[model samples]
Target chain A: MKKVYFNHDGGVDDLVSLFLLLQMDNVELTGVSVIPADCYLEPAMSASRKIIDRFGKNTIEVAASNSRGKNPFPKDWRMHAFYVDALPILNESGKVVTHVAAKPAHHHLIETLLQTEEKTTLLFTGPLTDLARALYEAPIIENKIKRLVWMGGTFRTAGNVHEPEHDGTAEWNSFWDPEAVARVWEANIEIDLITLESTNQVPLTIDIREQWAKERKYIGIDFLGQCYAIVPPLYYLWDVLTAAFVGKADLAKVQTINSIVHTYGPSQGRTVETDDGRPVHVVYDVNHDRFFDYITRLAKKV
Target chain B: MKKVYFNHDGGVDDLVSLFLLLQMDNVELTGVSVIPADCYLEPAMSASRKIIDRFGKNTIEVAASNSRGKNPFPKDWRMHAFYVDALPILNESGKVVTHVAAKPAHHHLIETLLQTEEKTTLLFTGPLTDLARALYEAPIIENKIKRLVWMGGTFRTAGNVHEPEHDGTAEWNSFWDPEAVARVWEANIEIDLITLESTNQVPLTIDIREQWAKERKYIGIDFLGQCYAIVPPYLWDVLTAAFVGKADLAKVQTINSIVHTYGPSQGRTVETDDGRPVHVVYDVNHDRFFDYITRLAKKV
Candidate 1:
C-alpha cells in the first residue's frame, strides 16, 4: 500500500477529503497533521482529531501547530474552535493516536518526514506555512518527498473582496504570510498549486451533506451532519481537490510552468510567473465527474 | 491664544481641517504629529509637512512615527508616500517642518505634551495608538489635557468593509487597536470621539474642493488647492469634524452616552457606569442634513 500523509486544516472540505482518502483502496494512511491557514493551527488539529475519532480513525497520528504563534485576537481563537468538537463518527473502532508539540509545525513536519520512510507522498491542504518552514529548516529533504499539493492562489479571477483605496487586489493565503510562501516557492521543490480560480468550482452543497446524512445515518457518522450546519450553503472543496488530485491524479489536468510567489508591494504575496521556463505541475483544471464520484464513494465507505 | 495641536494624518480631510484651523483667529498652532491609522504613518506625516510647507509654516514642528512598526508589506510604503507628495501645493511659500523620530510616537507625544503649558488640547485625526500609549505611560497627565478629540468609531452603522471572516465590524481607526481605545476611554480624561456614523454625512465633493481652492488661492494659502487635487468627491470628513468640533461645539450635537466597539462572536463592548464615559459629540446627522451635505459638496 502506498503511504500518504494527509495534511489538512479540519474544515468541512478537509473532513470530506479525509473520509475519501481513508476509504481509497491501495492507499495506506500513514498519519494526519493539521496546520493553520485561514484558521489557527491548534484548533485545526483539534478539529481534525475530533473528526478522526468520530470516524474511528483515531489510530492515525494527529498533531497540530499554528506555524504562526497563537492568534492575537480572542474572537479568532473562539470562531476557529467553534463546532469543531461536534463532527460525526465513522468506524468508531480505530485506536487514538496523539502528538502534542510546542515547536512550530514546520519542525514537526521535518521530524515526521525524517522518521517516515523515504518516497512518502506528503499531501498539503492548507496554507504552505509549515512546508515553507520545513523547506527552510531542512534544505536537504527537497528530493526525498514524492509530491506536494496545495489549495491556494488565485488566477484570472477577482478576489472575493477588493478595495480600490488599498490597491484593488485579493489573494488571502498568499497575503497572510507572504514571506513563508516566498520561501517555499524559492526552494524550487516540485509543487502543485490547486488554486481558487479552479478549485472553487467544485463545491459540496448542503443537499449533498443532507443526502449523505440520510443515507449514511446507518453508520451513525454525524461528521457530514455537523459540516452542513456550520458551513455555508455551498462549501468550497478547497482541500478535497488536493486530496483527490493525490488519490487519483487522472481526475485532474495539470499544466507545468515556472511559478513565482510575489511577496510585499501592493500585490502582497501573490503568485505570478515572470519566466515560464521552470517546470512544476500546476493543477489548473479538474474533472468534476470523476472527482465527485471518487469523493462520494469514499463517503459511502466511511 | 490657546495652544492647539493641529495634528493631521495627511488625508484630504486632514488638510482641509488644517487649512480651516490655521485660518481661525486666536488659535495658536503649536505642533503637528502624524501617526498611522487610516493609512501608514510616515506618508501621513510627509503629506502634513508638505501642506504646512506650502503655507510657509516651517516653524511649526512636524513629527512622524510608525505608531505601528514598519508595515509588514513595504510596497505600500512608497505608494502611500507618492499620494502624500502628489498632493497639490496650496501655497508655494508654505514651509514644512521636520521631526523624524527614531523611537516610537507615544514617547514623542509625552515629551511634547509635558513641555507645553497645562490644559493643552491634544487633537488626533489618525489612530489613537500613540496617544493611548502616552496615556498608559503617564496616567497622571490626564488632568493636563484640556480635551482629547479624535476622529474614529462608527455607531449604529455598518463598517466600510463588512467582511464576515475578518474583524471588519468596526471602524479602521478603532479596529487598528481596540485595546488602545479601551484604555483611553477608561482613563477618566475628557475625550470626544467624532465617529463615522455622524461625520460621514459631511461628504467631500469635487466642487467643494474646487471652490475652496479657487476662493483660498488668493490668500497665497494654496493648501485648499492641493487638497482639491488629491481628494475624491465622496471623501469622509474624519479629521475635519474633529477640528471643527473643537473650534465650535455648536457645529455638533453632544451625545451623553458612550459608544461600544463590536466584533465577530465577542459582540459589543458596551460603556458601563463603572467606566469613565468618553463624551461623543455627534457631528453630522446624515438623515436630517442630506440636503446640507449635497449643498456643501456643490459649494463650488
Candidate 2:
C-alpha cells in the first residue's frame, strides 16, 4: 500500500534485496538506485533490471552514482565481488538493459518526488553513500518522502566484525562509508532503521527455505531455484530481510530513540543511542512469520 | 480459539511458559499436566501451581516424577530442583495451598479429553516421556486433541547436545526421552511442533520486547509482572508461550517426520517423505506474536 524508492550498494544482500523489491507489488516500487561499484557501477546499474526483465518489469529504470564512495571498510572484510557477476543468477537468458535514463539517481529522486504528489517510502539496504549524496544534491527530497528505513547499525549487541579489525563496533554498511552514514544521520529524517539484532534473528536462511519446501502452500521454490544457482544460500540474507521489511514496518520491532552515527574514532560509523538527539524508529526485531508470508507470495508471483 | 492442555517438564522455560499460561482466557486452557522430573518433575509438577495459585487457581493441583532424570545429564548439570523454592518468586503472597493434585499428569490429560465434548490442543515443552507414558496409559487421548505442539528438536540446524556420550545428534528434549518423542510420532496424530532452530531464528529478546512498545495499539509494559520478579524482565525465548497465546508468529508446515527412538541419533528429528502429515513450525513473526502477548498482558 506504500510507495518505495530503494537505494543499494552492490553486494549479495543488496542483490537479493533488489530481487525481492522487483517481486513485490503491494508497495508502489518507484525505482531502484545504487552507488557505483568497483570497476564500475555496471553491476549495480543492471542489478534489478536483470532480475525483473525475466518477469517483465520494463517500465522501471535503474541509476547509479557515477563516482565511487570512498571505501573505509577493511581490505579483508567480505566486499562480495559476486555483485559484479550477479546478473547471471537472475538472467538465465543473458538479457541486458541499457539502464541509463538521461540522468543520475539523485536527479531521479528529486524528479520523482516533484512529479508524484504523495509521499513515498525510501529504503536503503546498502551503504548510505548514495542516499547521503542524494540528500546533499536534492535537500528538498528529505521532507518530500514519508519515512526512510535502512538495514544497518548494531546496538546493545555485538558488531558482526571481529575486533582489532576494521572498527569492530561499526556495521559494514556504515563502515564502508562512514562519511555518508554520518551525513545521513545528520540529515535527521524520521527513519525506521533496522539493526543486526533483528536481521540476525531472521537472516535470509536456507533452513527457512527447506521449511517452505514442506509447506504445500509454499511458492518460493522457483525464485530459490534461481537463487541457489548463483549465490550460496543465505548469502543474500540481510538485504532480502530488509527488502521484506521496508514496506511492512508494522511487522518489524522498532524503537523510537535518539542515536548518533559516529564519523570517526574507534566507533567510526557506529549508530548508537544517546540521551540528546532527534527521534527515529530503530527496527530491532521482525515479524518472522509475516515476512516469510510475504516472501513466499513474492516468490510465487514471479 | 483453540482448547489446550499444556504438558511441561518444569524447566525455566516451561516455568515461564506456565506463568504466561495463567495470564489469559483466550484459549480454553484445559488444565496443565506434568510428567514430574525424575530428579526434576517435583518442580515441574509444582511449577504451574506456583504461578497459578497466585491467580486463585487454588483448586488446580501438582504432581511429581521422582526417578527418571538419571540419563538426561550429569547430576551436577541438572537444574529443575526449584519446584520447592519456586513459590518464593510466583506465589509471593507466602501463601500455601495443598498443591499435590490428582494422579500423574497423564491422568489429568486423559480426564480433560474424555470429559470434554470438544477437541483440545495439546502442548508439550519438555521430554515426551509423559505424553508417551500417557499414550501407553490412554491411547485414545491422541485423537481427542486438535493439535499437539511442542518446543524442541533441530530439523536443519545443529543439535544442542555436545555429548560425546551416546549421540550428540539429538536435542535435550527429544534426547532426554527419545522413546517418548518416538511414541508420539508413532501415534501418528498431527502435531504442531516448534523447532528450537526456528525459535532461535526469532528468539524472544529485549529487542523484541521493545518492538512491542512501539505498537501503541499495544499496552502491556507490566505484561509479565511476576516474570520480571523472578527473571531479568526480558523475553524468555520460550516459543511455546507464543503457541499457547495463539500467537501467529510461527509459520506451520504440514510435514511428515521421522523421529529417532534410540541409538547414536536417538531423539534426532529428521524430515522424510515416508511419514504422516504433522504440522511443524520453523519460523515466527515476532511482531504479531508480541502484539498478541501484549493483548494477553492487557487481559491479565
Candidate 3:
C-alpha cells in the first residue's frame, strides 16, 4: 500500500480533504500534520485531533511542528483540528515552545518515509512558508518523498482586487511571502501547482453536501454538515482541489512549464516562468462532474 | 463716494455679490472686471455680460482676461465662473505661455492697477495663478495696491474626505499650483488672507437665505430660490467678509507660516520675514448677523 501524509492548515476544506483521504482504498494513512497559514497552528492541531478521535483513528501517530506563532486577529480562532493537543512544552533553554500542528518538520517526515518500505507522497495545501522552512532546515530529506503537490498561484487571470493604487501586481497566497515560495521553487523539488484559474473551476456546491448527508449518513451529516454550516458563501475549496487531484489525477489536465514567483506589494505575490522548456506538470483544467463524484464517493465510504 | 470695482467671475455667487455691492449707498460701483480661474476667458466674458444684463447692471464696464487652460482633475472644478468683455487684453505668447491659461494674462490686471489711480483695493477670490504670473512679468505693481484680500486654504481640519488614502494632504485650490501661492507670498504685496477654516466655521445656511428672502423683499425670487439649492453648503462670503470687515476681528485668529511649492506633496507657500507677521484669520463666530448688517446698512 502507498503511504500519504496529509499536511493542512486545519480549515474546514482541509478537514473535508482529510476525511476523504482517510477513506480511500489501499492507501496507508501514515499520519496527519497541521500547518499555519489561514489560521493559527495550535487551534488547527486541536481541531484535527477531535476529528481523528471522532473517526476512531486516535491510535494513529500524530505529531506537529514548533513553527511560527499564533495569528493576530480574533485571538482564539486559530487554524487547528479538534482532537490534537496544543500543550506548551519547555525547550532545552527552559523557554516555552508552542508546537505547531504539522508533521514533525521535514526531517521527521523523511525519517518516517525512510522507515516505511513503500513509496511516500507529501501533500501541502497552504502557503509554501512552512515547507520551504523545513527544506532549508533539513536538506537531506529531498529524495525521501516521491512527489510534492502544492495549491497556490493564479496565472493569466485578473486578481480579485485589481487596482493600480494598491496590491497592483500580484495574487494573495504567493504574494503573502515571496521569499518562502522562491526558496521552494529554486530547490528543484518536483512540484505540481494547483492554481486559482484552474482549481477554482471545481464547484463544491450545497447539493454535494446534501448528497454526502444521504450516503455516509451520520459521519457525513456531522462532518460535512458542520463544514457547510460554518463556511462562508463566497469561500472556495482551495485545498480540497489538491486532494481531488491526488485521488483522481485523470479529472484534471496538466501542462509543463517553468515558473518564477513575483513577490512585490502587500498581500500580492505570483508564480511566473518564461516558457523555457521544463518538465513540470501544472493542473490548468478540471472536469467538475468527475471531481465532485470522486469527493462524494470517498465521503460515503468514510 | 468710495469707488468699488466688482472684479468677478460670472458665477451665481459673483452675481449675488455684484447685486449686493450695487445696492450699497455711499459706494460707487466703478466697473466689473473678469478673470480666468474657473472657466475659459471667452465663456467667462459672455456669461458675465449675460448676468450683468439680467440684473440691470448693463451699464457697468466689463473687462475680461484671456487666461485659459489648467491641469484637469483637482483644479478643474474651480474654473466655474465666466469672464466679461470690457476688460483690457493681455496677449500671452512665447514658450512659458503654454504652461498657463492663455486668456488675458496677469499683466492685464497689472496694467489696470497701474493705469488706475494709486492705492486701489483689489478683491481677488479665485486662483492667484494669473496674479502670480503678472507679478513675475512686471515686478513694480506691488506698491500700487492698498489691500489684497483673497479666499483659499484649509488648516487643522480633516478634509472633506477624511480618508488618509484619498486626500492625504492639502486643499484643492491651494494644491492646484503651490508655486503660484509661493510667488504671491514672496512678492510682499499687502494681503488679507481669508482661508476656509475661518469662513466655513459659520456657513450660510438655508435659514439665513430664508431670512434674506423675507428682509430683502425687492430681491428677485429666482435669485433667492437658487440660494437655497446649493449642496454640502458653502462659504461663498469669505471674499465679502474680508472686503467689509463687518464681522468681529476677535472671532478670526491669525497664524504666521510659509509653504513649499512644486514638491512631491501640497502645502502653503507663505513665508514671513523676522518681526513681520502674515495673519491667516480662520474663524467667523458672527457670520449671519455680520452679513445682514453689512448687506443692509449704508456704507458711510
Candidate 4:
C-alpha cells in the first residue's frame, strides 16, 4: 500500500487537512503528528485523536511534537484548536480511541520511515523542525523517503508574518524556525513546496460559506461549515490547499527553482532564490474553481 | 394577551433573548427595537429583522435606535452580532420579511405604547437611553406602561465593567449611560431589575453546551448552540427575557438603590437608604431556569 506520514500544526486549516487526508483513497496514512506552531498542544492532541476516532477507518496513533518553534504564533491565532476541540461534533463520542504514540514527533517520523520497506511520502503542513531532527538522528531514513510535499515558504516580497523585528518577507511556517528550513534544505530528497502565493487564491469568503450552508444536508459539508464558522471571514485554507495537491496534483501549476534560507536578522526566516542552492518545485498558482471542487467532492464522499 | 415591548443591544445574550421572546405563548410582543450599545447598528438591525421573519408568528417592525451611548462596549463584544447574523441557519432562506420601523427606537417605543389599549411591559436588555428618551419626548406614555423589566445595574461592590476611565463598581448596561438610569428611575412604572448577581449563577459552561448539543436534533436547540459558539461565555440578557416569559423561575427582593451619574464612580448603582424601591433579582433556581429554556428551545 502507498504510505504517507502526516505532520501538522493544529490550526483550523491544519485540522481540516487531517480530515481531508483521512478521506483520500490513494494513500494509506501510516502515522500522524501534531506541532504547537499555530495551536496549543493539549487541545490539538485531544482534537486530533477525536477527529481520527470519528472519521478514520484505520486506528492510527497520533504523536505529539516535543519540538518547539523559535518564534511562536500569535495567541489569538493559536486559540482555534481549543474551540475546535470543544466542538460538539468532535466530542459527541465522549472518548478518544486512538492512543498517543510512545515516542515524540521527531523520533516517530524516523521510526515510521525505517519500518516501511516502500518509500513513504512525507507530508508536512507546519515548520520542518521534526523532519530536520529526524534526518539528523537517523540519516538512513532520508534515502528511504519517496519525496517531501510541504506547505511552507514563499518567494513573494510581501509574506504573512507581521510580528516585531520581522521584515514581513517570510511566511509564518518558514518564519517559525528558519534554522529548521536550512537543515531540511540539505536533504537530497525531491521537494514540492506549497507557497503562500497559491493558498492566497483560495480564501474563505462569505459566498463560499453560504454555498456550504446551502449544501449542509451532507454531514461532511456541515462539518466544513461548522469548522469555518468560528473564524472570522477571509481565512485562507493554506494547509488544505497543500493536502489537496497531494490528492490531485494537477490542481496547481509548479515552477522549479533553487532556493536558500536566511537564518538571522530582520529577514531571518525568508526563503530567498539563489544561484547556489538545492532545486525544488514551487507551486505558484492554483486553479481556484477546480481546487474547491476537489475538496468539496472529497468532503461529500464522506 | 399580555403585551411587551423589547428594546435590546445586540449581544449574543440579547439576540438569544429575542429568540426566546418569540417562543413565548402568552405575551404579545408589541414592538422590537435594537440599540447599538453592545453591537454594531447594521448587523444588529439586520439580524433582528431576520430573526423575527424566521422565528416569529406575527409580523413586527424592528426599530433602530438613533440613541448613542455615553460609553460604548468593547469592540470584540460588539462584533458578536455580525457572526450570529451570518449563521448558516439564519441565512438559509436568503430573504427577510420583517421590515424596519418607520421611526427610531425611542419614538417607536412611545408610538407602540400609545397604540396599545392595555398597559404594555417595557423590556430593556441594554442601556436605558431609549426608554429615557421616550419618557422625555412623550411623558403621557409613562401612564400607559405596565412595568419595566431591565437587565442592568448591580448592588455589589464589584461589577462587570473594567474600563480605564471608570471604577469597577458598575454593570456594563448601567455604565453605558448612567443618566438614562436616573431618568427611568423617576418614572411611576414598577421596576424589576435582573442584576449581575443573579445572571452570574447561570453561565454558559461546556457542560451546558454539550447538553444543548445532545438535544440538537431539535432545530431550536441547534440554533441556541450555534449562536453561543461565537461568544466566550455569559447569558445576562437571556435572564431578563426569561423573567418576562415566566417570573416564577427566579426570586426577587425589593431594594432601594440610586444611580451615581458622575466622577470616576459614574454609572454605579449604589444601595442607598432613601431611594425608589425596585424588585432586584437576588437568587435563581438554576435547574428550573435551564429546564425552562431547554423546554422553550424545543418549541420551534
Candidate 5:
C-alpha cells in the first residue's frame, strides 16, 4: 500500500475525501491534519477526529493547526454543519489511538515525514499554511516529501471566487493564504495542481453517485449519506475529487504553467498566469470515467 | 398612460426589462437613468440607448452615472455581452430626443420626480446608489417619490453571494452597494423586494419561454434570442412602465426585520439582519408569476 500524509481544512466536501481515503485499498493513510482551511482551528480539529472515530480507524495521529488571524473572515458555513451533524458521529466507539492529536499540524507533518522509512507524498487539500510553516521551521523538509500534490490555483483565469475585489481570479485555498502559497512557490519544490477548473467539470449528480455506487450505497455508503443530507448538492467537491485524483494520478491531464500567487491588495490571495514564476504541474482537465471507475471500487472491508 | 422612470446596471437581463416596459400599452416610459450598477458608467449608457432605439421608442432620455470608486469592483462580465449583442439594435433609427442624456443620473432622477405632474413611484432594478444620492442631496426627496420597489435582499439566511466572507448572508445588488441600501433602509420608505431567493425559484426555461412565445419566430424575438443566446434564460426583468406592485407584489411575502450593511471583510457590502429596521419584501412564492409573465409576453 502507498503510504500518504493527508491534511485538509475541514468542510463537508473534505469529509467525503476522508471517507474515500479511509476506504481505498491501494492507499494507506499515514496520519491526518485538519487546519483552519475553511473555518476556525478547533472546530476543524473536532471534525477531523469526528471522522476518525466514525470510520473506527483510530490508529492514525490527527493534528489540528491554526492560522492565528491571517484569515479575513471565518468560513463558518461548513463548520456549523460539522458541529451539528458530526458531534453525533464522534459519540460512537472506534479503535482508540492513545494520542488523538500529536501536536500542531506543522510539527506533526515534519516529524512524520522525517521519521518515515519510505518517502511520502503530501496530499494537501487546503491552504498551504501548515506545509509552509513545516518548511519554514525545518528548512530541508522538502527532501523528505516525495512530491507535493495540492488542490490550489488554476492555469487559466477560471476562478471560483466571485468577489468584485478578487475579480474572480483565485480559488478558496490560494485566496485563503497567498503569502504561504508564495512561500511554497519560492521553495521550488516539485508540485502538481488539481485546480478549480478540473473539479467543477465532474458533477456529483444522483445517477453518477449511483454509478460509482457512491463511488457508495454499500453498508459504508451511509457514511457519505449523512454528510450529503446536510450539504446541498449544488456545491462542487474540491477536496474529495482531489483525493480521488491522488489515488489515480493518471486520471488528471496536465499542463505546465507559470503559476503566481498575489500577496497584496484587493487581489490579495489571487493566483494569476505570470511568466515570472515557478513552472508547476497544473491539471487543466480530468478523465471523469476512469476517476469514477477506480474510486468506486475502493471500499471498506465488507 | 402611466409615466415611469427606469434604471439598470446594463446587462442582457436589464435589456429584457427594458423591452418589457417599451411594449406594454398602459405605459409610457418617462426617461431612463442607467447607473454603474455593473461595470463602468459609459457601457451601461450605451446598452440603455441601444434598447430604446431598437424598440424605436427614442423620445425618452437616458443618462449614465458614476460610483466614485465606492464600488470595489467593475462587474464587467455582462458588459461584453451587452456591447457585442445589443449594439446591433441601436443601428436601427429612432426619433432622437434633443436632450437624451439630460443630466447625471442622480440629478436627472430628482428633477424627473419633482417635475412629474402625478404621484410617481420609482421602479428600481439596480444598485440604489443614484437614488441614495438624490435622497442624501435633498433630504425630502422621498416625499416626491411615491414608493420604492426593487430587486434586492433575501428573506431568510438563504443568500446567493457564494463568497466565503459574506457567508451566504447577502444578495448581489444589496451586497454591491450596502451604504446606499442602508440609506434606503433609514428613510422609512415603503419598499418591496424581489430578492435573489425568489428569482432563482423562477427560471425562464425553454418551456416557460415558449409559453411566453419568446419562442417567437420573429426578428423581434431574435433581438431577445441573440441576448438569450449567450446567457441562460435565468435572469429577471426591471420594467416599471407596465406593472406596478408588478403582478407579484402580494406574492412578495414580507416581514418587519432589521437589515444592515457591512463595511469590512468578505462580508463587506453585505445586507444582513440587525436590531430595529424597516419592513421589506424578503420573498415571493411565484405560482402564477410565469403565467402573468406569459400573458405580458403575448402582447409584445
Candidate 6:
C-alpha cells in the first residue's frame, strides 16, 4: 500500500477529504494534521478525530498545527469546520477513539516521515506553513518524503482571494502564507501542484447534491449530502479534488511549468509563471465525470 | 375542528410553524400566506408551498403578500427561507404541487375569514402587516375572527431590537411594522399576544438539537433538525405557533398595552391602564411545550 500523510485546514472540503482518504483501499494513511487556515483549529481537530474513528480501518492520531498565517482567511469561510464537526452522523457515537498526537503538526509531520519504512507522499490540502516549518527544523527528512502533492498556487490570472490589500490574483491557500510557499519551494522534494485550474472544473452543483440525497440510503452518501448542505449553494470541491487526485492520479492531467510565488505587494502570495523559476508539475485539467464518479464510488463503500 | 389562518414571514421558525400547524389534529388550517417581513417573498412562498405539499393532509394554497415593512429585516436573517426551500427532504419530489393563491395575502386573509362557517383563529408569526391591511380593507370581517394569536412586541423595557438610532426596547416583529400592530390593536378582535418575554424561555439549546438529531430516525424530527441547523444556534416564533395549536401549553395575563408606531422607539409595546387589553403570554410549561412539539413532529 502507498503511504500518504495528509495535512489539511479544516474547511468542509478538507474534512470531507479526510474521510475520503480513509476510504482508499490502496492507500495507507500514515498521519493526519489540521491547520487553522480556512477553519478553526479546535473543531477541525475534533472533526478529524471523529472522522478517523468512524471511517478509518487503521488507527491514527491527529495533530494540530500551531503555525499562524501571514494573512488570515475570512471568518465566514472559517466557520465551516464547526458545522462539519457538529454534524449528527459524525457525532452519533458521541466518542472519539483516535487520540491526538504528542507533538504539534510540524513536529509530528517530521516524525511520521522519518519513521516511515517507505518514502511517504505528502498531501497538503491547505497552506504549506506546517510542512515548511518542519523542513526548517529538520532538513534531513526531505529525502524521506516521496513527493508533495499540494492544492494551492494557481497560474491563472484571476484567483480566489478577494480580500482587502489583495489584487484578487492569489488563491486563498497560497495567499494565506506566501512566505511558507516560498520556503517550501526551496526544498528538493518533487512537487505536484493542484491549482485553481483543475478545482474550478468541479463546482458542487445542485444535481450532484440531489444525486447524493437520492442515494442517501448509504450512510456515507448521506453524510456527504448533509455536510454539503451546511455550506452555501455555490461551492467547489477544492480539497476533495486534490484528495481524489492523490488516491487516483490518472483522474487529472498535469503540465510541467516553471512558476514562482510573489512574496510582496498587492499580488503577494500570487504564483506567477516565469522562465527562471523552479519546475513544478501543475495540474491544469481534470476529468469532471470520472472525478465525481470516483469520489461518489469511494463514498459508497459500506 | 378549529379553523385557523397562518400568516408568517419566512424564517426557519416560521416555516417549521407551518409544518407543525399541518400536524395539528384539532386545527383545520384554512389558508396560509407568506409576508416578506423577516423573509424574502419568493423562497418563503416556495418553502410554504413545499411544506404543504410534503406534510399536509388537507389541500392548502399559500398566498404571497405584497405588504412591505417600514424597517426591513437584516439580509442574513432573511436568507434562511432560501436554505429551507432548498432542503433535500423538501425537494425530494423535485416539484411543488400546492399552487400559489390567486390574490395577495390581505385579500386572501379576508376571503379565508369570510368563507369560514365558524370563527377562524388568525396566527401571525410575523409582522401584523397582512392582517392589519385585511382589517382595513374589510372591517366587517372583525366579528368573524375568533382571536389574533400573534408573536410580536415585548412589554418589558429591554426588548429585542438593538438597531441604530433606536433604544433597545422593541421586538423584531413589532419593529418591522409598528403601524400594523397599532391598526390591529385598534380592531375589536380579541388578541392572544405572544411576546419575546415568553419566547425567550425556550432558546434553541444544543441538548434539544442533539435530541432532535438522535430521533432524526423519524423524518419529521430530522426535518426539524435540518431546518434549524441552517440558523445560528438559537426560538422562538415556534412558541407562538405551539401556543396557537395547544393553548394549555402556556400561561397568560390580560395586559393593557400600546405600541410605538414611529420614531427611534418605534414598535415598542408598553403597558398602561389607558391602553387596550390583550392576553399576553407570561410563561410556558417548558417540559410540556417541548413534549408537545416533539409529539407533534413524531406523528409525521
Measured by DockQ, the strongest candidate is: 4
- Model 2, B68-128: lDDT tens digits are 5424654422343342233223323344464665566667677877887898878887677
DockQ list for all candidates: 0.01, 0.01, 0.01, 0.40, 0.01, 0.39
Question: Can you write out model 6's per-residue Cα lDDT over B1-300, one digit (the tens) per residue?
Answer: 789999999999999999998999989899999999888888899889989998998888999999988888888788778777766677666678998999999999999899888999999999998988998999998989999999988877888777887788999999989999999999999999888887756777888888877887788998888787666342678898888888998888998989998888999999999999999986788888899899999998
TM-score of each: 0.46, 0.46, 0.43, 0.94, 0.48, 0.95
Write candidate 4's Cα lDDT for B1-300 as tens digits.
679999999998889989988998977899999999999988899889888888888989999999988989998789888877876667666678898999999999999999999999999999999999999889999899989999998888889899988989999999999999999998888999999888767877888988887777787887888777665335788989999888998888999889999888999998887998999986777888898888988999
**Per-residue lDDT of model 3, residues A1-302, tens digit only:** 45777677666677767766766774666666765655566556654554555442335654565445211222222322321221110001122232232446444555666777766777877566666776787765566666777777766645543534445445445554567777777775687778777666676664554454344234443345434433422145778788777776788889888777765554346566577533357896788888877776666564
The alpha-carbon lDDT assigned to residue A211 of candidate 4 equals 86
What are the per-residue Cα lDDT tens digits for candidate 1 across B1-300? Answer: 566664555555665555555544445566667665454555566656655554433366666655662112223222333343433232122334545545456666776667787567777776566777888888767766787777766655365544344344466556656666777777767766666655545565544444443444243223333334332223344344434433442245444443344345111223445545555554555433433322232332
lDDT of 2 by residue, A26-137 (tens): 7777777776532235545665566556553537777765545554444322233332233222433444663565667767767776677788888887777777777888
Tens digit of per-residue lDDT, candidate 1, span A204-231: 6644554554453334233444344344
Once model 5 is optimally superposed onto the true structure by TM-score, how far is the C-alpha of residue A42 displaced, in angstroms? 3.5
Residue B284, model 4, lDDT: 78
- Interface RMSD, candidates in the order listed: 29.9, 24.5, 35.8, 2.7, 23.1, 2.6
For model 4, the stretches where C-alpha displacement exceeds 4 angstroms are B232-234
**Could you give the CAPRI-style class of model 4?**
acceptable
What are the lDDT scores of the predictions, listed in order? Answer: 0.56, 0.62, 0.53, 0.87, 0.63, 0.87
For model 6, the chain A TM-score is: 0.98
TM-score of chain A of each: 0.82, 0.84, 0.79, 0.97, 0.87, 0.98
Question: How does model 1 fare in lDDT?
Answer: 0.56
Q: Which 10 successive residues of model 5 chain A have the least lDDT summed?
A: A82-91
Query: What's the TM-score of candidate 2 when only chain A is evaluated?
Result: 0.84
Tens-place lDDT per residue, model 5, B185-274, is 778477755665556555656554433223443445534543453332245443222235254433444455545566333222223354
DockQ of 1: 0.01
